[PDB]
């Protein structure tokens, strides 16, 4: 697909048959999802942006289906206003910026 | 050019004769640079991120060259962790996301 930047680059992802809308975010090193219950061991982590830091839980080797593409990696869960797909998963689906 | 996301997408930009490192951020609506002076009148605005709600200075119609592609639009200046090129300037240089 070719996604233009006139609008926020929102696409549908699927995590364990829970389907949500998330932002394709080249400005994010990590993927951060608003509250969901993921299984497995989760470790506390702090991540910052504009405004400061939020506490999130880091879940490792979590399958994420982004637009037909099978993604598997680290997913952070916390009080993020919008769901974010970061560079960790973006690189796995073969995503680039082209101009 | 084509930019992969294994590393953060930092590029050199020229703004007011000055060269800076900035990050191509498709998860940012707007372009925010770290503290600096620029030519103008400016309106104060508030914008929010993962952390919350900062105060920035808004400059309108400012020329910025990104990897030599010419843009002219809004540029906010404030307490951003890194220089960020948002979607308002990314669209002008015809930047897209592909996979």
């Amino acid at each position: 697909p070719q996604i233009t930047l006139w609008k926020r680059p929102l696409v549908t992802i699927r995590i364990g048959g829970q389907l949500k809308e998330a932002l394709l975010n080249t400005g994010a090193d990590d993927t951060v999802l608003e509250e969901m219950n993921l299984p497995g061991k989760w470790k506390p982590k702090m991540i910052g942006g504009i405004g400061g830091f939020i506490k999130v839980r880091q879940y490792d080797q979590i399958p994420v289906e982004i637009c037909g593409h099978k993604a598997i990696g680290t997913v952070l869960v916390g009080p993020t206003p919008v769901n974010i797909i970061g560079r960790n998963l973006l690189t796995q689906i073969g995503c680039t910026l082209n101009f | 050019p084509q930019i992969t996301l294994w590393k953060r997408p930092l590029v050199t930009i020229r703004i007011g004769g000055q060269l800076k490192e900035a990050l191509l951020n498709t998860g940012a609506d707007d372009t925010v640079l770290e503290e600096m002076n620029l030519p103008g009148k400016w309106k104060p605005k508030m914008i929010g991120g993962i952390g919350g709600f900062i105060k920035v200075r808004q400059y309108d119609q400012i020329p910025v060259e990104i990897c030599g592609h010419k843009a002219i639009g809004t540029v906010l200046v404030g307490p951003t962790p890194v220089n960020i090129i948002g979607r308002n300037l990314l669209t002008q240089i015809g930047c897209t996301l592909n996979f």
Binding site: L23, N25, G27, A28, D29, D30, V32, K45, M46, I47, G48, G49, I50, L76, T80, P81, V82, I84, G86 | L23, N25, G27, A28, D29, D30, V32, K45, M46, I47, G48, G49, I50, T80, P81, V82, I84, G86
Partner: peptide, 8 residues
Amino acid sequence: RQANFLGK
């Protein structure tokens, strides 16, 4: 991690 997301 700095997931520099922004709206406004």
